[PDB]
Motif scaffolding. Structure first.
Motif, PDB file in Angstrom:
ATOM      1  N   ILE A  75       0.810  -1.210   0.000  1.00  0.00           N
ATOM      2  CA  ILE A  75       0.000   0.000   0.000  1.00  0.00           C
ATOM      3  C   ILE A  75       0.848   1.265   0.000  1.00  0.00           C
ATOM      4  O   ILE A  75       0.325   2.350   0.263  1.00  0.00           O
ATOM      5  CB  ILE A  75      -0.974   0.011   1.186  1.00  0.00           C
ATOM      6  CG1 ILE A  75      -0.197   0.058   2.498  1.00  0.00           C
ATOM      7  CG2 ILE A  75      -1.867  -1.208   1.146  1.00  0.00           C
ATOM      8  CD1 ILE A  75      -1.023   0.451   3.679  1.00  0.00           C
ATOM      9  N   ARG A  92      -7.711  -3.971  -0.396  1.00  0.00           N
ATOM     10  CA  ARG A  92      -7.069  -2.906   0.356  1.00  0.00           C
ATOM     11  C   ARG A  92      -5.853  -3.383   1.124  1.00  0.00           C
ATOM     12  O   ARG A  92      -5.256  -2.602   1.865  1.00  0.00           O
ATOM     13  CB  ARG A  92      -8.070  -2.270   1.317  1.00  0.00           C
ATOM     14  CG  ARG A  92      -9.237  -1.617   0.623  1.00  0.00           C
ATOM     15  CD  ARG A  92     -10.299  -1.201   1.609  1.00  0.00           C
ATOM     16  NE  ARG A  92     -11.349  -0.434   0.955  1.00  0.00           N
ATOM     17  CZ  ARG A  92     -11.327   0.881   0.800  1.00  0.00           C
ATOM     18  NH1 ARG A  92     -10.324   1.614   1.251  1.00  0.00           N
ATOM     19  NH2 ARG A  92     -12.337   1.476   0.172  1.00  0.00           N
TER      20      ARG A  92
ATOM     21  N   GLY D   1      -0.259  -3.868   6.357  1.00  0.00           N
ATOM     22  CA  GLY D   1      -0.924  -2.584   6.269  1.00  0.00           C
ATOM     23  C   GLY D   1      -2.154  -2.634   5.393  1.00  0.00           C
ATOM     24  O   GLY D   1      -2.180  -3.346   4.396  1.00  0.00           O
ATOM     25  N   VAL D   2      -3.172  -1.869   5.763  1.00  0.00           N
ATOM     26  CA  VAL D   2      -4.438  -1.830   5.045  1.00  0.00           C
ATOM     27  C   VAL D   2      -4.666  -0.413   4.535  1.00  0.00           C
ATOM     28  O   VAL D   2      -4.334   0.566   5.212  1.00  0.00           O
ATOM     29  CB  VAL D   2      -5.605  -2.321   5.932  1.00  0.00           C
ATOM     30  CG1 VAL D   2      -5.810  -1.414   7.125  1.00  0.00           C
ATOM     31  CG2 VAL D   2      -6.881  -2.445   5.123  1.00  0.00           C
ATOM     32  N   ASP D   3      -5.189  -0.309   3.317  1.00  0.00           N
ATOM     33  CA  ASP D   3      -5.375   0.978   2.650  1.00  0.00           C
ATOM     34  C   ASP D   3      -6.761   1.533   2.979  1.00  0.00           C
ATOM     35  O   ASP D   3      -7.685   1.533   2.165  1.00  0.00           O
ATOM     36  CB  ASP D   3      -5.175   0.824   1.149  1.00  0.00           C
ATOM     37  CG  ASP D   3      -5.119   2.152   0.422  1.00  0.00           C
ATOM     38  OD1 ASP D   3      -5.251   3.211   1.069  1.00  0.00           O
ATOM     39  OD2 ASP D   3      -4.942   2.134  -0.814  1.00  0.00           O
ATOM     40  N   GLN D  20     -26.145  17.264  34.022  1.00  0.00           N
ATOM     41  CA  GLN D  20     -26.093  16.469  35.237  1.00  0.00           C
ATOM     42  C   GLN D  20     -27.426  16.459  35.976  1.00  0.00           C
ATOM     43  O   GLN D  20     -27.473  16.072  37.147  1.00  0.00           O
ATOM     44  CB  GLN D  20     -24.988  16.982  36.157  1.00  0.00           C
ATOM     45  CG  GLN D  20     -23.594  16.882  35.570  1.00  0.00           C
ATOM     46  CD  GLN D  20     -23.134  15.453  35.399  1.00  0.00           C
ATOM     47  OE1 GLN D  20     -23.223  14.646  36.319  1.00  0.00           O
ATOM     48  NE2 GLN D  20     -22.634  15.132  34.214  1.00  0.00           N
ATOM     49  N   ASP D  21     -28.497  16.894  35.318  1.00  0.00           N
ATOM     50  CA  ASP D  21     -29.827  16.906  35.912  1.00  0.00           C
ATOM     51  C   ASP D  21     -30.256  15.474  36.198  1.00  0.00           C
ATOM     52  O   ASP D  21     -30.381  14.665  35.277  1.00  0.00           O
ATOM     53  CB  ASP D  21     -30.800  17.594  34.957  1.00  0.00           C
ATOM     54  CG  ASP D  21     -32.220  17.701  35.502  1.00  0.00           C
ATOM     55  OD1 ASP D  21     -32.545  17.121  36.555  1.00  0.00           O
ATOM     56  OD2 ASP D  21     -33.034  18.381  34.846  1.00  0.00           O
ATOM     57  N   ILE D  22     -30.499  15.167  37.473  1.00  0.00           N
ATOM     58  CA  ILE D  22     -30.776  13.786  37.847  1.00  0.00           C
ATOM     59  C   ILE D  22     -32.158  13.346  37.380  1.00  0.00           C
ATOM     60  O   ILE D  22     -32.354  12.178  37.035  1.00  0.00           O
ATOM     61  CB  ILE D  22     -30.587  13.591  39.362  1.00  0.00           C
ATOM     62  CG1 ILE D  22     -31.477  14.542  40.155  1.00  0.00           C
ATOM     63  CG2 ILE D  22     -29.139  13.804  39.737  1.00  0.00           C
ATOM     64  CD1 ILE D  22     -31.468  14.264  41.629  1.00  0.00           C
ATOM     65  N   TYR D  23     -33.135  14.253  37.355  1.00  0.00           N
ATOM     66  CA  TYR D  23     -34.447  13.897  36.819  1.00  0.00           C
ATOM     67  C   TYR D  23     -34.372  13.614  35.327  1.00  0.00           C
ATOM     68  O   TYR D  23     -34.981  12.652  34.831  1.00  0.00           O
ATOM     69  CB  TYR D  23     -35.448  15.011  37.109  1.00  0.00           C
ATOM     70  CG  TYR D  23     -35.762  15.157  38.574  1.00  0.00           C
ATOM     71  CD1 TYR D  23     -34.964  15.929  39.403  1.00  0.00           C
ATOM     72  CD2 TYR D  23     -36.850  14.512  39.133  1.00  0.00           C
ATOM     73  CE1 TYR D  23     -35.242  16.056  40.740  1.00  0.00           C
ATOM     74  CE2 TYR D  23     -37.138  14.639  40.469  1.00  0.00           C
ATOM     75  CZ  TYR D  23     -36.330  15.411  41.267  1.00  0.00           C
ATOM     76  OH  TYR D  23     -36.614  15.537  42.602  1.00  0.00           O
ATOM     77  N   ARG D  25     -31.723  12.532  33.819  1.00  0.00           N
ATOM     78  CA  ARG D  25     -31.020  11.259  33.687  1.00  0.00           C
ATOM     79  C   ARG D  25     -31.931  10.077  33.997  1.00  0.00           C
ATOM     80  O   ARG D  25     -31.821   9.024  33.362  1.00  0.00           O
ATOM     81  CB  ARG D  25     -29.791  11.248  34.589  1.00  0.00           C
ATOM     82  CG  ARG D  25     -28.718  12.219  34.151  1.00  0.00           C
ATOM     83  CD  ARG D  25     -27.339  11.619  34.264  1.00  0.00           C
ATOM     84  NE  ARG D  25     -26.366  12.370  33.485  1.00  0.00           N
ATOM     85  CZ  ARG D  25     -25.393  11.821  32.774  1.00  0.00           C
ATOM     86  NH1 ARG D  25     -25.235  10.511  32.718  1.00  0.00           N
ATOM     87  NH2 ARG D  25     -24.558  12.606  32.104  1.00  0.00           N
ATOM     88  N   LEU D  26     -32.837  10.225  34.964  1.00  0.00           N
ATOM     89  CA  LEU D  26     -33.783   9.152  35.258  1.00  0.00           C
ATOM     90  C   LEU D  26     -34.713   8.898  34.082  1.00  0.00           C
ATOM     91  O   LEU D  26     -34.958   7.746  33.698  1.00  0.00           O
ATOM     92  CB  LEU D  26     -34.596   9.487  36.504  1.00  0.00           C
ATOM     93  CG  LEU D  26     -33.892   9.290  37.839  1.00  0.00           C
ATOM     94  CD1 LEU D  26     -34.786   9.749  38.964  1.00  0.00           C
ATOM     95  CD2 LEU D  26     -33.514   7.837  38.007  1.00  0.00           C
ATOM     96  N   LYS D  29     -32.931   7.155  31.456  1.00  0.00           N
ATOM     97  CA  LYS D  29     -32.889   5.721  31.738  1.00  0.00           C
ATOM     98  C   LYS D  29     -34.170   5.040  31.278  1.00  0.00           C
ATOM     99  O   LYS D  29     -34.138   3.976  30.640  1.00  0.00           O
ATOM    100  CB  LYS D  29     -32.682   5.483  33.231  1.00  0.00           C
ATOM    101  CG  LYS D  29     -31.286   5.740  33.722  1.00  0.00           C
ATOM    102  CD  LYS D  29     -31.216   5.601  35.221  1.00  0.00           C
ATOM    103  CE  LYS D  29     -29.878   6.062  35.744  1.00  0.00           C
ATOM    104  NZ  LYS D  29     -29.645   5.574  37.123  1.00  0.00           N
TER     105      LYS D  29
ATOM    106  N   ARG F  33     -32.119  19.005  43.505  1.00  0.00           N
ATOM    107  CA  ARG F  33     -31.271  19.303  42.359  1.00  0.00           C
ATOM    108  C   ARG F  33     -29.849  19.559  42.834  1.00  0.00           C
ATOM    109  O   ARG F  33     -29.429  20.715  42.984  1.00  0.00           O
ATOM    110  CB  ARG F  33     -31.830  20.490  41.587  1.00  0.00           C
ATOM    111  CG  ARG F  33     -31.463  20.486  40.154  1.00  0.00           C
ATOM    112  CD  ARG F  33     -32.374  19.628  39.327  1.00  0.00           C
ATOM    113  NE  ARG F  33     -31.945  19.737  37.944  1.00  0.00           N
ATOM    114  CZ  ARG F  33     -32.320  20.709  37.127  1.00  0.00           C
ATOM    115  NH1 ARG F  33     -33.238  21.591  37.481  1.00  0.00           N
ATOM    116  NH2 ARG F  33     -31.758  20.798  35.928  1.00  0.00           N
ATOM    117  N   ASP F  35     -27.006  19.384  41.323  1.00  0.00           N
ATOM    118  CA  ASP F  35     -26.172  20.168  40.419  1.00  0.00           C
ATOM    119  C   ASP F  35     -26.414  21.661  40.600  1.00  0.00           C
ATOM    120  O   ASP F  35     -25.465  22.451  40.639  1.00  0.00           O
ATOM    121  CB  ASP F  35     -26.418  19.750  38.971  1.00  0.00           C
ATOM    122  CG  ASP F  35     -27.877  19.816  38.580  1.00  0.00           C
ATOM    123  OD1 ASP F  35     -28.685  19.072  39.168  1.00  0.00           O
ATOM    124  OD2 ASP F  35     -28.213  20.602  37.673  1.00  0.00           O
TER     125      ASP F  35
ATOM    126  N   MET G   7     -29.445   8.571  42.611  1.00  0.00           N
ATOM    127  CA  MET G   7     -28.780   9.554  41.765  1.00  0.00           C
ATOM    128  C   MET G   7     -28.144  10.655  42.598  1.00  0.00           C
ATOM    129  O   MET G   7     -27.163  11.269  42.169  1.00  0.00           O
ATOM    130  CB  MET G   7     -29.755  10.150  40.755  1.00  0.00           C
ATOM    131  CG  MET G   7     -30.380   9.127  39.841  1.00  0.00           C
ATOM    132  SD  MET G   7     -29.310   8.622  38.490  1.00  0.00           S
ATOM    133  CE  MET G   7     -28.619  10.192  37.999  1.00  0.00           C
TER     134      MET G   7
END
Ligand SMILES: [Mg+2]
Ligand SMILES: [Mg+2]
Ligand SMILES: [Mg+2]
Ligand SMILES: [Mg+2]
Ligand SMILES: [Mg+2]
Ligand SMILES: [Mg+2]
Ligand SMILES: [Mg+2]
Ligand SMILES: [Mg+2]
Ligand SMILES: [Mg+2]
Ligand SMILES: [Mg+2]
Lengths: 225, 240, 128, 63, 109, 53, 125
Positions: A75, A92, D1-3, D20-23, D25-26, D29, F33, F35, G7
């Motif tokens: 290459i 490749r 080696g690969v091109d 960073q708001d935990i609500y 983030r919940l 989830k 809260r 944060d 949390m």
RNA sequence: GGCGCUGGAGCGUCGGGCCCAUACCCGGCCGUCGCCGGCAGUCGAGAGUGGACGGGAGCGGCGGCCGGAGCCCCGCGGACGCUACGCCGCGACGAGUAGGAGGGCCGCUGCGGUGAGCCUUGAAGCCUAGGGCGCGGGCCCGGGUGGAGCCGCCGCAGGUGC
């Protein structure tokens, strides 16, 4: 409802087992039919040549429609056009192999990348060895080893290819779905040629390794994988 | 139930039978052997005895553990092979046939020429370069660590005793029961004792191996001699 | 004798020596602590053969045996008796070191409590 | 080696809220679970919008 | 009573011109001067036996000065009867030109 | 939970309940809260600082 | 709620110990003493903990009652089991499994009780 | 390139072997990237590519031609997990100046919290053919010297690394 649900699960499992048995029988018979077709073609070529020689004429065989292409140069320091065509051939890396359906466009591409490749016309044994020993599928953009027929069936069954034998048949006899079957295969990662090369920097017809060797690509493959 | 039959599918190559599926169907007569339709007590009841202790007691076997370690190890996966050593197939080199003169390469009998009798259940050879010739008793040896020469004696129709087995020749040990910390030396019994049974077996085997050794000239001298590498000779050029 | 870990795998170290700083042998002012060479002509940085090797991620230890002591345990630092009962349920994989500044009379009690809880201490006889 | 070329290997996208708001983030989830365990592409769109920044979540007027 | 091992010389390590792979050694077995004659010695145990200052335990005997680095022949090297050997620890460079014993132990004959 | 406000007993100076109950103020169901609390604490702890140079 | 409180305290807690690439939690009702949502002994509506008894014999099994969640003085009920090891493990197994009181902590509690009893029994010579 | 080489160790045309690069193939380990992959099912009864009912009319195997209700229990039992900012799986990939970005349970100093933290039964600092951990920045422990203070974690702030 315990007895009834036991009956339900037993019936479902039995139906699944019968379906697997039917599919396995189909695979077996398809392979048998492919064997018959292969021997018919192999004998037909010989018979045609024999009748031409008996009549005193010449039988010109059909120009080969399948090629195996192996990238033999690395290459480093590659011109942009050669680089692009190698990428389009999916070569490749050095000692990468790919089946190519031969026509005017593909042959002209091969002529472009002629110094960087060694290509030829694989036979049935070469196709079998390549698919069985180094055959990997491109399943969900992943390089998955072809360890089961279900891997082929889930990706190519809509085209009728459901087993190793169907894949080998489609590759060897260039079928309608050759493009799909060939692109399903990851490019073959072959080893270094055991016994060495002659000269990678020159053409085959001048004592080297690059370019089109007609059917010596099979010898190269045997030493290569 | 019925009497078990032989396989009826002769093996021609390992993993492949000689007859196909339909051929074996017809051979088994599966066309008429068609079928459609038709524990251990964990707890034991024991009379406890004594007045007004109730009737009996339902005592279970295998009571639950008294203690659990803080953490365990997950169980292994399954390997569909890896048989134990007792179930391994035993392979013997084609140059080692009963009556062959072998050369010992390791141990205190290094370089001695002995007589091969039979392979045992563990694959170890049983040899006796007769004790009157080169002081090699009925003794096990490993086929990897011997050289099979070309000279052979016909030890057919001699009676190797049946009790001469791997369990017979297995080493015995004394230490260490009833003793944990060594303040008084337990070096006793270290003198291995030749059993009268072993002496009787050695005499019985040698009494019928020796006349066949004396049947060919100076083979007894050959067996008394030991093997060595002279500075001119090379093992790859030697025919054994 | 000594308490044994749950499992004792073979610990494989890709490299056993230390990555010494380039030219730390020629100067006392240059400590052996690794510094990445950034000189324009630096042959160690350029990775010429026969030179001082540079650390990289390929030398990383197996994640199963990383931070494992030769005994098979993993080390945890404790300063008093209360921080020792956190290892009660990690007994078979973690061993405790008493901190260097803990007094002799306190580490005696720590050692005794660890013996009670079957927790291994790598320095059980350290101030006596 | 690969091109091959490595400049586009890493796709630049939000895999989690930078907040960073935990609500938040919940409920991220919750919608992570729903988008994983359902075939509803609506849940996927809502999850990727929850990952987004304030400028990428403009206010919607009542009109 | 007899030598019972073939003499060999530690010729050197597997190497290019300017790179040396110390994990495998090149052995010159005496009397073996062709590649086709090396098949006998493939897989045979080989030993580098030397002496040192401190006594070490001897299997089946009293401690003495003798030490061994065990190894075995792996494959043929070149066309002239060289063989390659792998030892448990890489051979010391002071042993170049010194004796290696090929022990005949894993006999295939 | 947020709309539910329990009754908290008022304890006498002797430590036991006095029989009086106060409905939980709605501020105790406000969003928690950390944060924002950390941000406000960080920026207000700088306001009592005394300059150095 | 348990998830919200988790949390809050998953990284900021006085019981949190982060040392030697490890993490531990020292709150009273934490089986396995690990910093985790499942094993946290403060955030859940029902919790179970196993401690050594005041005297060095037996165990104390403490469980959190359902009603007084905001009343820490009466929130925990403690029983003392001073039977043999098998009987103690059976009692803990029945308290967790038969009551369906946090069945996901059953083996953690059994193992912790076993560890406590093994620590309590006299050493050997 | 040197020694040397002249039935070649020279020149031309060729053959078979053989040597080894960080290149190619197989395998192990590390990391990055990708599958915006899997896991809230801790669901030892969960049982899921439809089940429910509720009466039509029917067979099929057992309960002398009329025939039918099943609920775990001789065992009360059943590993680990899931800091979800966690854990697990698969595939590909890995040069780097100037430069950009991320991570740092790398390091220094001080502040708010916290460790019912450490310490004259010996802190800081320093020395050490002592034992180790980490790819690394670095860190922990043993021994000595020393004689009064010091550190971990969550945040905050710099006159913060030669
Ligand atoms: Mg080039
Ligand atoms: Mg070769
Ligand atoms: Mg060129
Ligand atoms: Mg290291
Ligand atoms: Mg220095
Ligand atoms: Mg430069
Ligand atoms: Mg690479
Ligand atoms: Mg790059
Ligand atoms: Mg890089
Ligand atoms: Mg400055």
């Amino acid at each position: 409802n315990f007895a009834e649900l036991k009956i339900k699960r037993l019936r479902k499992k039995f139906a699944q087992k019968m379906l697997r048995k039917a599919r396995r029988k189909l695979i077996y018979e398809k392979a048998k039919h492919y064997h018959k077709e292969y021997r018919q073609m192999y004998r037909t070529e010989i018979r045609m040549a024999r009748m031409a020689r008996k009549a005193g004429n010449f039988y010109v065989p059909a120009e080969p429609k399948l090629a195996f292409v192996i990238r033999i140069r690395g290459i480093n320091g590659v011109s942009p056009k050669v680089r692009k065509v190698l990428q389009l051939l999916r070569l490749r890396q050095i000692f990468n192999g790919t089946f190519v359906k031969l026509n005017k466009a593909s042959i002209n591409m091969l002529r472009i990348v002629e110094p960087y490749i060694a290509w030829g016309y694989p036979n049935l044994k070469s196709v079998n060895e390549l698919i069985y020993k180094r055959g990997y599928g491109k399943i969900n953009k992943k390089r998955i080893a072809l360890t089961d027929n279900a891997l082929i069936a889930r990706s190519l069954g809509k085209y009728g290819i459901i087993c190793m034998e169907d894949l080998i048949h489609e590759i060897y006899t260039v079928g309608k779905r050759f493009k799909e079957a060939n692109n399903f295969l990851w490019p073959f990662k072959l080893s270094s040629p055991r016994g060495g090369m002659k000269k990678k920097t020159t053409h085959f017809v001048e004592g080297g390794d690059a370019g089109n060797r007609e059917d010596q690509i099979n010898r190269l493959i045997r030493r290569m994988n | 139930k019925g009497k078990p039959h032989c396989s009826r599918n002769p093996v021609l190559v390992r993993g492949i039978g000689r007859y196909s599926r339909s051929a074996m169907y017809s051979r088994k007569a599966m066309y008429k052997r068609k079928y459609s339709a038709a524990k251990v007590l964990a707890t034991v009841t024991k009379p406890v005895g004594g007045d007004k202790n109730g009737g009996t007691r339902v005592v279970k076997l295998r009571k639950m553990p008294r203690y659990y370690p803080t953490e365990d190890v997950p169980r292994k996966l399954l390997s569909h092979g890896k048989k134990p050593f007792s179930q391994h197939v035993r392979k013997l080199r084609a140059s080692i046939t009963p009556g062959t003169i072998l050369i010992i390469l390791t141990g205190r009998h290094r370089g001695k020429r002995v007589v091969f009798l039979k392979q045992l259940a563990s694959g170890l050879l049983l040899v006796t370069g007769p004790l009157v010739l080169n002081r090699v008793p009925l003794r096990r040896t490993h086929q990897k660590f011997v050289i099979a020469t070309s000279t052979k004696i016909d030890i057919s129709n001699v009676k190797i005793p049946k009790h001469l087995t791997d369990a017979y020749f297995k080493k015995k040990k004394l230490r260490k029961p009833r003793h944990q910390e060594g303040e008084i030396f337990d070096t006793e019994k270290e003198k291995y004792e030749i059993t009268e049974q072993r002496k009787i077996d050695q005499k019985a085997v040698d009494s019928q191996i020796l006349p066949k050794i004396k049947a060919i000239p100076q083979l007894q001298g050959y067996l008394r001699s030991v093997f060595a590498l002279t500075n001119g000779i090379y093992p790859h050029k030697l025919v054994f | 004798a000594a308490l044994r870990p749950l499992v004792k795998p073979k610990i494989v170290k890709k490299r056993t020596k230390k990555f010494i700083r380039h030219q730390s042998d020629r100067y006392v002012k240059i400590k052996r602590n690794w510094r990445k060479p950034r000189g324009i002509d630096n042959r160690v940085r350029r990775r010429f053969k026969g030179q001082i090797l540079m650390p990289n991620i390929g030398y990383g230890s197996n994640k199963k045996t990383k931070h494992m002591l030769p005994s098979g345990f993993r080390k945890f630092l404790v300063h008093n008796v209360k921080e020792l009962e956190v290892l009660l349920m990690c007994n078979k994989s973690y061993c405790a070191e008493i901190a260097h500044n803990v007094s002799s009379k306190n580490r005696k009690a720590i050692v005794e409590r660890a013996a009670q809880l079957a927790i291994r201490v790598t320095n059980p006889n350290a101030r006596l | 080696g690969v091109d091959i070329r490595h400049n586009k290997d890493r796709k630049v996208r939000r895999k989690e809220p930078k907040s960073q708001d935990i609500y938040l983030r919940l409920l991220v989830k919750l919608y992570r679970f729903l988008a994983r365990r359902t075939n509803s592409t609506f849940n996927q769109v809502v999850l990727k919008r929850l990952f987004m920044s304030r400028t990428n979540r403009p206010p919607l007027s009542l009109s | 009573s007899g030598r019972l091992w073939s003499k060999a010389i530690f010729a050197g390590y597997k190497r290019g011109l300017r790179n040396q792979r110390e994990h495998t050694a090149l052995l010159k077995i005496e009397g073996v001067y062709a590649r086709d004659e090396t098949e006998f010695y493939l897989g045979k145990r080989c030993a580098y036996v030397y002496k040192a200052k401190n006594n070490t335990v001897t299997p089946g005997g009293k401690p003495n000065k003798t030490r061994v680095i065990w190894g075995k022949v792996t494959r043929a090297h070149g066309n002239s009867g060289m063989v390659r050997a792998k030892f448990r620890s890489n051979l010391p460079a002071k042993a170049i030109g010194h004796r290696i014993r090929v022990m005949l132990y894993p006999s295939r004959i | 939970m947020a709309c539910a406000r329990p009754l908290i007993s008022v304890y006498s100076e002797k430590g036991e309940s006095s029989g009086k109950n106060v409905t939980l103020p709605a501020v105790f169901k406000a969003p928690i809260r950390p944060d924002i609390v950390n941000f406000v604490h960080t920026n207000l702890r700088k306001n009592n600082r005394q300059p150095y140079a | 709620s348990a998830h919200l409180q988790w949390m809050v305290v998953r990284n900021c807690s006085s019981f949190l110990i982060k040392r030697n690439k490890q993490t531990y939690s020292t709150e009273p009702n934490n089986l396995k003493a690990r910093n985790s949502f499942r094993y946290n002994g403060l955030i859940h509506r029902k919790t179970v903990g196993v401690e050594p008894a005041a005297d060095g014999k037996g165990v104390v099994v403490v469980i959190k009652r359902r009603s007084g969640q905001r009343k820490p003085a009466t929130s925990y009920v403690r029983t003392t089991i001073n039977k043999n090891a098998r009987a103690t493990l059976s009692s803990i197994r029945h308290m967790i499994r038969k009551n369906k009181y946090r069945p996901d902590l059953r083996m953690a509690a059994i193992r912790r009780a076993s560890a406590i009893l093994r620590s309590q029994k006299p050493v050997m010579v």
